[PDB]
Design a protein around this ligand. Structure first.
Ligand SMILES: CCNC(=O)c1c[nH]nn1
Ligand SMILES: [Cl-]
Length: 115
């Protein structure tokens, strides 16, 4: 079901190494809907290459546009299992401190802030 369940540790590590080689300015991001979630739709895909210069505030805007949300749908983005302290941080910095050991950056979204 989940990304980690679909691919082996070995496969996830190698895929991150291929993105390093072919798309060196990109952050490899896994974005998954909360398993509880009722209101928001699922994304068309799981794996995203995010320009390393955009901050978390712009990634939230990007994802809200990709889900085709409207002005008054709530949207909450967890990173590496927890709330973001700040949305102003560049994803390059966020990546260095929050990356998984497989080298992906894992995110989960919901309409409730209480996941
Ligand atoms: C099948 C739904 N597709 C989308 O909503 C989308 C957005 N960007 N690329 N695809
Ligand atoms: Cl690149």
């Amino acid at each position: 079901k989940t990304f980690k369940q679909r691919r082996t540790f070995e496969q996830r590590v190698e895929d991150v190494r291929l993105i390093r080689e072919q798309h060196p300015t990109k952050i490899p991001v896994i974005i998954e809907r909360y398993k509880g979630e009722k209101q928001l739709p699922v994304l068309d895909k799981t794996k995203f290459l995010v320009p390393d210069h955009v901050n978390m505030s712009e990634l939230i805007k990007i994802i809200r546009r990709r889900l085709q949300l409207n002005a008054n749908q709530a949207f909450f983005l967890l990173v590496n299992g927890h709330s973001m302290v700040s949305v102003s941080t560049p994803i390059s910095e966020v990546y260095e401190s929050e990356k998984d050991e497989d080298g992906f950056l894992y995110m989960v979204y919901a309409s409730q802030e209480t996941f």
